[PDB]
Design a protein around this ligand. Structure first.
Ligand SMILES: *[C@@H]1O[C@H](CO)[C@@H](O)[C@H](O)[C@H]1NC(C)=O
Ligand SMILES: *[C@@H]1O[C@H](CO)[C@@H](O)[C@H](O)[C@H]1NC(C)=O
Ligand SMILES: *[C@@H]1O[C@H](CO)[C@@H](O)[C@H](O)[C@H]1NC(C)=O
Ligand SMILES: *[C@@H]1O[C@H](CO)[C@@H](O)[C@H](O)[C@H]1NC(C)=O
Ligand SMILES: [Cl-]
Ligand SMILES: [Cl-]
Lengths: 119, 126, 597
């Protein structure tokens, strides 16, 4: 009974695709907004996607049209589908609720490394 | 003219039930509490029960608590007293009376009742 | 890229995350207010604390966007409301202490009971016990006991807390660059940087006081007439020149004189315009009351209540086992969830409250399109004036007759006209000096004009001077009679009730003009008028997106509160009362007191 742990990150080629999964408890999934954040080693944390209980979504211009935040009610999981990845998206990814963000309760992060494309 | 007429007094046995009815005149029946008193042969008149002008609040003396139930029908200008599981100690003349005020907590003594009925004898045997 | 584009991005994130946090805080509050339990009070506090933390985070984040470099009014207003620090300006210990005092005062009021000295288990609560005595009792001594026991058992308890509350509240307000807590509250009316539509906090006092002077003659005549009627009701207890004894005014404080109608009705033998008995005779229930109120809004073009309103609202007292807070409330939980919590009684007062509260729900349904922060009335008086608009029409004999609560053979006489206006004046006019004097006291207390050793001395000098109401028994500084009223001990501004009263007649005048109504304003019913409904809806859907001076002007053509429509409504009654009081004293002596000898 420890939730909001990000997983699925690994090594990916440029312009590739990867899908992160966020396992949340049924109580938290049903009543909380779930967001995906990322942090480059040295840089600050950045919200990359957010999804309300009603399914309303938020994405910044930096990842608009490339990333997709989803909710699977059957498995109480929030997925982040990242398409057309770039080396600028290389960061450790975490999933969190706005209240846990304020109280600084951060779960397990998943490292996503994007390798540079050929000539 | 305010008038109160009790009805339903009679001879009953121990354990039996008996309902006393009280009809009161006046278009402001709902504005005053209605109470029942009893007076045994040789004893002073004592308080029995009181019901607020709205009927949503009641109070009973220790001797009748959980045996007697005071109710009122503001539409029919009447106040009732159901007396279940009667004892020989309940044998007295019963009076219904109208209080000066509306509540149960402030109107439970004779000095708070300006209108009285003519009385109704209730007798209980062994 | 630009600072406006940056603020827009910030507000999109805010509006997104606010939906769930607010809905969970509101649902927990609903689940506590309808089923008062320790499990539900803790759930309410958990969700509420999460909401407060989000608001304190987003507040500090909004600070980096100077609202001077913002042209878009919609984003400027949302940013302006978010960058308010409020209670967060206080140290951790002071925020904790202030919330402790606030909760303690709130629970003393809601759980305070007066008891029998020889039987401490036999007790009464304010609602319904003591309020029933104050509303229906005809005995001077019982009413005096209920009045003095409320102020003595509970008011004396609130006094030390209120003294501490004013200190911390003033520290909070002065740290936010306000003069005092009263000045802070008057900030709700403030509009700035909008040429022609500006309004200062100081202007509120000047306008409330200038308006009140015009109310004064109508009130004095209503007061003198009531005083004559009360002398018949309570012989030997009222002076023909003195103030009205505080315990004989219809409720626990004399906030409304509504329950004096039986004692003061001008023409008693006329068919009663208080349909409370006709509802009871027709076996009306709370569902009929609420379905009837819903039918009124549909008639002016507005929508029916949502399915969730009929599924989730609590329209009656659960009473036995499940305990609820019976203050009539309109709930806008967000996520399209609207509910009403009200322990409805089959009374005309509750029938009018059902219309008032559904008016609140209709305002909520209308501005739901607005961004989160702009989902409120143009000012604190807007929501209260809108509900009262519904009551003005609902209460008319023309309306009650059309809904069956008045016989089809009902004839509107010039006497029924006075019977109607007198009943209205007891509620509407009767509350204006009470409301003005209540806030005037708080404003002066917060300002520092009234020292603690004179709080109660000044309260009763102001009650006698402004309200023409006198304490039946002397109260020293151990009492705190202001705190014995819900809004005082529960930290709510009261001037909304004064401003809403004036707004309601401005709106009613404008709405009847839209409905092509011929004749006196008091004979107007906006039912079955979609023209009136549209004019109202266009203002309702606006929320807080436009300053109140502009929002008011868009409906009534005046960018400020005006007493003229209120006076025109009561004109027939004013000229009647003038003749009734021809050989009476009009006004009062502040020296007469029930306890003087
Ligand atoms: C209060 O709400 C309902 C009332 O029927 C009940 O089922 C629920 O258990 C209560 N909540 C508590 C006791 O926390
Ligand atoms: C202000 O910004 C909001 C949000 O983008 C937009 O709906 C509105 O049209 C803007 N107002 C203008 C351009 O006056
Ligand atoms: C706190 O909010 C107040 C308004 O209530 C504002 O005047 C002040 O600048 C804020 N304090 C900051 C930004 O530190
Ligand atoms: C409008 O008038 C009354 C309400 O005041 C109502 O009984 C009637 O049905 C309405 N008229 C129509 C055409 O529905
Ligand atoms: Cl300021
Ligand atoms: Cl008072």
């Amino acid at each position: 009974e420890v939730q909001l742990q990000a997983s699925g990150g690994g090594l990916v080629q440029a312009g590739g695709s990867l899908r992160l999964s966020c396992a949340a408890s049924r109580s938290t999934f049903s009543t909380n907004t779930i967001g995906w954040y990322r942090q480059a080693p040295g840089k600050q944390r950045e919200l990359v996607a957010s999804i309300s209980t009603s399914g309303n979504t938020y994405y910044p211009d930096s990842v608009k049209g490339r990333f997709a935040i989803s909710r699977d009610n059957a498995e109480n999981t929030v997925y982040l589908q990242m398409n057309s990845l770039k080396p600028e998206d290389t960061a450790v990814y975490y999933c969190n609720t706005p209240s846990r963000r304020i109280s600084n309760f951060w779960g397990q992060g998943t490292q996503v490394t994007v390798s540079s494309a050929a000539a | 003219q305010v008038q109160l007429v009790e009805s339903g007094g009679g001879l009953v046995q121990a354990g039996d039930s008996l309902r006393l009815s009280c009809a009161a005149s006046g278009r402001t029946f709902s504005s005053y509490a209605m109470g029942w008193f009893r007076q045994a042969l040789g004893k002073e008149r004592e308080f029995v029960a009181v019901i607020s002008g709205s009927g949503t609040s009641t109070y009973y003396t220790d001797s009748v608590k959980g045996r007697f139930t005071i109710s009122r029908d503001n539409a029919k200008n009447t106040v009732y007293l159901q007396m279940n599981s009667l004892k020989p100690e309940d044998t007295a003349v019963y009076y219904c009376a109208r209080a000066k005020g509306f509540s149960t907590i402030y109107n439970q003594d004779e000095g708070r009742y300006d209108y009285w009925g003519q009385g109704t004898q209730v007798t209980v045997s062994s | 890229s630009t600072i406006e584009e940056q603020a827009k991005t910030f507000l999109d994130k805010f509006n997104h995350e606010a939906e769930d946090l607010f809905y969970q805080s509101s649902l927990a509050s609903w689940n506590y207010n309808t089923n008062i339990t320790e499990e539900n009070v803790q759930n309410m506090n958990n969700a509420g604390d999460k909401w407060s933390a989000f608001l304190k985070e987003q507040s500090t984040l909004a600070q980096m966007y100077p609202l001077q470099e913002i042209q878009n009014l919609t984003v400027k207003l949302q940013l302006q409301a978010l960058q308010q620090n409020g209670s967060s300006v206080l140290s951790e210990d002071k925020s904790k202490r202030l919330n402790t005092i606030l909760n303690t005062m709130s629970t003393i009021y809601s759980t305070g009971k007066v008891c029998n000295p020889d039987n401490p288990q036999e007790c009464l609560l304010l609602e319904p016990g003591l309020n029933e005595i104050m509303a229906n009792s005809l005995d001077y001594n019982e009413r005096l006991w209920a009045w003095e026991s409320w102020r003595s058992e509970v008011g004396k308890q609130l006094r030390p807390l209120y003294e501490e509350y004013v200190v911390l509240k003033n520290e909070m307000a002065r740290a936010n660059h306000y003069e005092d807590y009263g000045d802070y509250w008057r900030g709700d009316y403030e509009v700035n940087g909008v040429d022609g539509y500006d309004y200062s906090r100081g202007q509120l006092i000047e306008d409330v006081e200038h308006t009140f002077e015009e109310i004064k003659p109508l009130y004095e005549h209503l007061h003198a007439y009531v005083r004559a009627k009360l002398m018949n009701a309570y012989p030997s207890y009222i002076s023909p020149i003195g103030c009205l004894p505080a315990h004989l005014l219809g409720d626990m404080w004399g906030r409304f004189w509504t329950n004096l109608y039986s004692l003061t009705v001008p023409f008693g033998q006329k068919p009663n315009i208080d349909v409370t008995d006709a509802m009871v005779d027709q076996a009306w229930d709370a569902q009929r009351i609420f379905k009837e109120a819903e039918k009124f809004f549909v008639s002016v073009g507005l929508p029916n209540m949502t399915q969730g309103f009929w599924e989730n609202s609590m329209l009656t007292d659960p009473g036995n086992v499940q305990k609820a807070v019976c203050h009539p409330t309109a709930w806008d939980l967000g996520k399209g969830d609207f509910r009403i919590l009200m322990c409805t009684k089959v009374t005309m007062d509750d029938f009018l409250t059902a219309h008032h509260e559904m008016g609140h729900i209709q305002y909520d349904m209308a501005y739901a399109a607005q961004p989160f922060l702009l989902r409120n009335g143009a000012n604190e008086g807007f929501h209260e004036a809108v509900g009262e608009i519904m009551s003005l029409s609902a209460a008319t004999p023309k309306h009650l007759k059309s809904i069956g609560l008045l016989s089809p053979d009902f004839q509107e006489d010039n006497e029924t006209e006075i019977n109607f206006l007198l009943k209205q004046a007891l509620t509407i006019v009767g509350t204006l000096p009470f409301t003005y004097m209540l806030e005037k006291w708080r404003w002066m207390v917060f300002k520092g004009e009234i020292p603690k050793d004179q709080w109660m001395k000044k309260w009763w000098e102001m009650k006698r001077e402004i309200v023409g109401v006198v304490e039946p028994v002397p109260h020293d500084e151990t009492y705190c009679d202001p705190a014995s009223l819900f809004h005082v001990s529960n930290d709510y501004s009261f001037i909304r009730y004064y401003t809403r009263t004036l707004y309601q007649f401005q709106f009613q005048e404008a709405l009847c003009q839209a409905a092509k109504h011929e004749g006196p304003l008091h004979k107007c019913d906006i039912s079955n008028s979609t023209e009136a409904g549209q004019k109202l809806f266009n203002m309702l859907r606006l929320g807080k997106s436009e300053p109140w001076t502009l929002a008011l002007e868009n409906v009534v053509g005046a960018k400020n509160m005006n007493v003229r429509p209120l006076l025109n409504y009561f004109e027939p009654l004013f000229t009647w009362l003038k003749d009734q009081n021809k050989n009476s004293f009009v006004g009062w002596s502040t020296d007469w007191s029930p306890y003087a000898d």
